[PDB]
Amino acid sequence: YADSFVIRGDEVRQIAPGQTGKIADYNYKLPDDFTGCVIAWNSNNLDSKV
Amino acid sequence: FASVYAWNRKRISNCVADYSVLYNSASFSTFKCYGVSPTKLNDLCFTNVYADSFVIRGDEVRQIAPGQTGKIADYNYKLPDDFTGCVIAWNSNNLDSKV
């Protein structure tokens, strides 16, 4: 399974098992026994507009 | 792009320049002209246009201004006090920075 989205800078910490915040408990929730991997990278050039 | 201590310089003449495509595309963070009104650039006729290109840190864009002091202005690139023209600066984090 591959899931994709876009978040803010500080929110990459919230994408982890046993996490609390706003996105973690309202938009995307990870099971505690999750197995797999998570990849994140910057896209300020492309996804940001003046 | 070239480094600041060897800033690249080009001269352009005998050309028909469309300055609209520069002004409309607002992706440039800093768009500051000094001697002229930026919106009027498509109405004046010139010769011997000079374009200097380089890459610098984010902090030092404020040092690219007439009558400025610091470390890069007085060692690498000094502007004349009576300079006339314009300065363009925009972000290049995607390709010019590596993990």
SS3 B11: strand
> Which residue blocks in B1-99 are alpha helix, DSSP H?
20-23, 93-96
Q: Which residue of B has its CA nearest to A47?
A: B94
Question: Do residues B85 and B25 make contact, with C-beta atoms less than 8 angstroms apart?
Answer: no
* Long-range contacts of B59-64, Cβ-Cβ distance < 8 Å, separation of 24 or more: B61/B30, B61/B89, B64/B89
Report angle CA B75, B80, B84 to the nearest 5 degrees: 135
Question: Do residues B4 and B54 make contact, with C-beta atoms less than 8 angstroms apart?
Answer: yes
Q: Which residue of A has its CA nearest to B91?
A: A45
Is A9 at the interface with chain B, CB within 8 A?
Answer: no
Resolution of the deposited coordinates, in angstroms?
3.3
Which stretch of DSSP H or E encloses residue A26?
A: helix A23-26
SS3 B83: coil
Experimental technique, in short, is: cryo-EM
Q: Name the one residue in this structure whose structure tokens are 């309202």.
A: A26
